[PDB]
Design a protein around this ligand. Structure first.
Ligand SMILES: Clc1ccc2c(NCC3CC3)ncnc2c1
Length: 258
């Protein structure tokens, strides 16, 4: 089984990415170099959907040259019927790795955090707020985290967590770069304490109520890394104005010292 993209033939090893109008394949070029090919079927896509797809592709292509913490787009083919994207394969996505992980090495966690800040800072610098950050949006490649997507794509049953959702998004029923800081904060909180801040709340309506409720205090059990603890408290402030920024996070002792 094979796919051609801009003349070049790729043999398929397996399917990574599953279901929807979109599939991801692990593939090899004729020199046996490994890649991921993202395949999108465009037959049922309206113009607004199409426009979001072209817009994410254009941004991914542009911002590549600005950080190596953003996934590599090598090439693509795009017609009225389909998109093929030839991309960096990597080793494993962050969520699948975290699921099979007993505990995280403090050094690795700090390193992943640095990568995540770098990727997200980069998109913010070009006017993009992701607004839907989770572990699955990060790919581990040679012990480096890379951002897989920018959250621009429009649309593609018991999945789609609200665990990383910021309070101002829920009260808004504005989104800003601080919204990404919250979700990053929930990812780091999960890498620190083994769960996300509101993961205990069974009912989703209740969960959303806890997220926005000032009287609902998030717990920050004492840990050896006091700087890590402070990062979490700064990221998980409900008021976006008082929430720490990415530039402030990049100067934080947690990422700078030792
Ligand atoms: Cl676009 C893209 C590229 C690679 C992905 C990936 N790679 C890890 C799979 C073991 C090969 N895992 C999950 N999603 C991916 C998405």
């Amino acid at each position: 089984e094979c796919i051609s993209v801009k003349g070049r033939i790729y043999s398929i090893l397996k399917q990574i990415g599953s279901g929807g109008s979109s599939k991801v394949f692990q593939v090899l070029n004729e020199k046996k170099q490994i890649y991921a090919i993202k395949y999108v079927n465009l037959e049922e896509a309206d113009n607004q959907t199409l426009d979001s797809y072209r817009n994410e592709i254009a941004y991914l292509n542009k911002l590549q040259q600005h950080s190596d913490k953003i996934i590599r787009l090598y090439d693509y083919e795009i017609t009225d019927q389909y998109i093929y994207m030839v991309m960096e394969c990597g080793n494993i996505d962050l969520n699948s790795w975290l699921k099979k992980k007993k505990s995280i090495d403090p050094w690795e966690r700090k390193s992943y955090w640095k990568n995540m800040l770098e990727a997200v800072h980069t998109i913010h610098q070009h006017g993009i707020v992701h607004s839907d950050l989770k572990p699955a949006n990060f790919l581990i490649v040679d012990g480096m985290l890379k951002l897989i997507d920018f959250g621009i794509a429009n649309q593609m049953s018991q999945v789609g967590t609200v665990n990383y959702m910021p309070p101002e998004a829920i009260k808004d029923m504005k989104i800003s770069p601080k919204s990404d800081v919250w979700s990053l904060g929930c990812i780091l909180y999960y890498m620190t304490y083994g769960k996300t801040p509101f993961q205990q709340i069974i009912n989703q309506i209740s969960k959303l109520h806890a997220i926005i409720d000032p009287n609902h205090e998030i717990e920050f059990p004492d840990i050896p890394e006091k700087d890590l603890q402070d990062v979490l408290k700064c990221c998980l402030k409900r008021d976006p104005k008082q929430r720490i920024s990415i530039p402030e996070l990049l100067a934080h002792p947690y990422v700078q010292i030792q």
